[PDB]
Design a binder for this molecule. Sequence first.
Ligand SMILES: NC(=O)C1=CN([C@@H]2O[C@H](COP(=O)(O)OP(=O)(O)OC[C@H]3O[C@@H](n4cnc5c(N)ncnc54)[C@H](OP(=O)(O)O)[C@@H]3O)[C@@H](O)[C@H]2O)C=CC1
Ligand SMILES: O=C(O)COc1cc(F)ccc1C(=S)NCc1ccc(Br)cc1F
Length: 312
Amino acid sequence: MASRILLNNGAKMPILGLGTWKSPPGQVTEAVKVAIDVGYRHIDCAHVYQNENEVGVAIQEKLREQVVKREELFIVSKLWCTYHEKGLVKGACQKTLSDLKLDYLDLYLIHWPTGFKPGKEFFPLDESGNVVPSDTNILDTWAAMEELVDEGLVKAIGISNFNHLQVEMILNKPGLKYKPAVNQIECHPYLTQEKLIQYCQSKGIVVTAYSPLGSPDRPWAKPDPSLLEDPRIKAIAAKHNKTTAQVLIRFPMQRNLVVIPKSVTPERIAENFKVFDFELSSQDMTTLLSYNRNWRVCALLSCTSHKDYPFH
Ligand SMILES: NC(=O)C1=CN([C@@H]2O[C@H](COP(=O)(O)OP(=O)(O)OC[C@H]3O[C@@H](n4cnc5c(N)ncnc54)[C@H](OP(=O)(O)O)[C@@H]3O)[C@@H](O)[C@H]2O)C=CC1
Ligand SMILES: O=C(O)COc1cc(F)ccc1C(=S)NCc1ccc(Br)cc1F
């Protein structure tokens, strides 16, 4: 299968990237180095993950080694919720750039639609545990993202965890200058996202599937459904002489999605890349879709009253 998808900014995005949430800072430099050595050309990052400096060390070393050229990499990061303010967006982007050892990002996303009170804390709470909102809306935040394109800091801008109506808000913005290139959302067989995907794809927005393996290392896991252990998925894998993870990665690829599995295990980083030499049948695809149960890895009770919280 073709390795890249065309975005609505004219650039091409690798359909398979390496996730970095939860990758320990003492492991992620090697993980990214290994990933680039074995063929990854897309790394998914975020300031809130607290490991961009270490991701950047890997990127810079592989550029310096001339393993890759900068033009061949596709580096994604995300604006955290406490930086939804006109006067904070550029500096947030620049901190990410400085940490990643880059002079531009290929794609910069609004990480969540909700803005929070600025300050040192990533989740400022009131004394009853509710997140403290910012008054700044997604349209004004989008305008600030557009400025980053116009300043050369980012080649593409997009959104993440935006629901149907929030995507529509963005698309209907008065004076919209750049459409979102991508909406990055949770997507896997237990949360198949058909409705949001069809909306987004119909508008030309590329969808990236996060937590494609069901985020088994998520910190709030309970002893919960498990994609990797689901014998029905294991059976499809066995039929194709592939691992369950490889099936879970190939699945979104055949839906015209980008997918960003995370690993810090070198053998798995390599395993997860070996997904371009087999095809799931239409029956396999429909069977995997049938496992939907509307189950989310990423949700957060403290944020559910924010006006712009995306999920119900
Ligand atoms: N925009 C957003 O709001 C969000 C974005 N994301 C992005 O998506 C990425 C992927 O999602 P994430 O939630 O991390 O979870 P994933 O679904 O990618 O699962 C990661 C887990 O699966 C394990 N694993 C990886 N490969 C294999 C394999 N071949 N066999 C068995 N186990 C395997 C990893 O273990 P190990 O590392 O020990 O090998 C880790 O515990 C994130 O890292 C982040 O970049 C995720 C959530 C939210
Ligand atoms: O968010 C990620 O990329 C991965 O997850 C995280 C990664 C981090 F580095 C810190 C917190 C999260 C959490 S708790 N994320 C869920 C979450 C955050 C904000 C809102 Br609005 C809703 C929500 F569901």
